[PDB]
């Protein structure tokens, strides 16, 4: 792919809208719209990436490449077939990416798109939202069971916390929906403070599954949250906490 564009502005804000949801526009400018629709089950996924030519002029040598770090490539298997290199004016084309999670991962793939448009050369780079929580599935459990598991994860490096300013209104119902969207079960009457949220789930990867517990604590007067994750793996607590911290 030769010289690669630096990540488009808005790439990171956009990437964050795709963590608890599967459907959306990932990138759009005056020439091109990139849309996604995905679904996951256990350690697998299927993503549809749609490329729309918003102009009256054909794109030639239209070349989407997915670019992964050397470690990412060992943790995540992406399979696709490239699009035809010519995209007509007004057309939307697509590709299907078949995804297999081999083990826990923290980096995101980059989608790089290059093409000719008239006499110009176009180069777009954006982060692809394939994230560890996409392999996160809910675990329902009573309070007693929760606290047993919580107390088993008492090593310092198993726990990660973050304190942050709410980006959105601290809307109870929407907060519950994003926790669910993230892949967690929402467990009621575990924290005796009814303002607090508690979650459990399991990450499903080809080689190992990791049990995860979470607690979110809003302070509506201060407009701030504390999120605590405990998992058996420091990298998994880290990643899920960073991800989940950007949702509220």
């Amino acid at each position: 792919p030769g010289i690669l564009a630096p990540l488009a502005p808005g790439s990171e804000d956009n990437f964050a809208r795709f963590v608890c949801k599967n459907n959306g526009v990932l990138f759009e400018n005056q020439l091109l719209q990139i849309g996604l629709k995905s679904e996951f089950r256990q350690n697998l996924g299927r993503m549809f990436i749609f490329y729309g030519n918003k102009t009256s002029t054909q794109f030639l040598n239209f070349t989407p490449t997915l670019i992964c770090a050397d470690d990412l490539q060992t943790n995540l298997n992406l399979q696709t077939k490239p699009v035809d290199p010519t995209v007509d004016g007004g057309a939307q084309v697509q590709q299907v990416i078949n995804i297999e999670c081999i083990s826990d991962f923290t980096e995101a793939p980059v989608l790089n798109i290059q093409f000719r448009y008239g006499g110009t050369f176009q180069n777009v780079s954006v982060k692809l939202p394939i994230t560890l929580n996409k392999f996160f599935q809910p675990t329902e459990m009573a309070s007693q069971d929760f606290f047993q598991r919580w107390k088993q994860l008492s090593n310092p490096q198993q726990e990660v916390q973050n304190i942050f300013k709410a980006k959105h209104p601290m809307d109870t119902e929407i907060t519950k929906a994003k926790i669910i969207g993230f892949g967690s079960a929402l467990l009621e009457e575990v924290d005796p403070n009814p303002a607090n949220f508690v979650g459990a789930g399991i990450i499903h990867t080809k080689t190992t599954q990791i049990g995860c517990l979470l607690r979110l604590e809003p302070n509506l007067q201060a407009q701030m949250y504390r999120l605590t994750l405990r998992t058996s793996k420091d990298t998994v607590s880290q990643r899920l906490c960073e991800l989940l911290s950007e949702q509220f």
Binding site: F147, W150, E217, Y225, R226
Partner: peptide
């Protein structure tokens, strides 16, 4: 059955 501490 408890969390040891609390944010608020």
């Amino acid at each position: 059955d408890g969390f040891k501490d609390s944010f608020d």
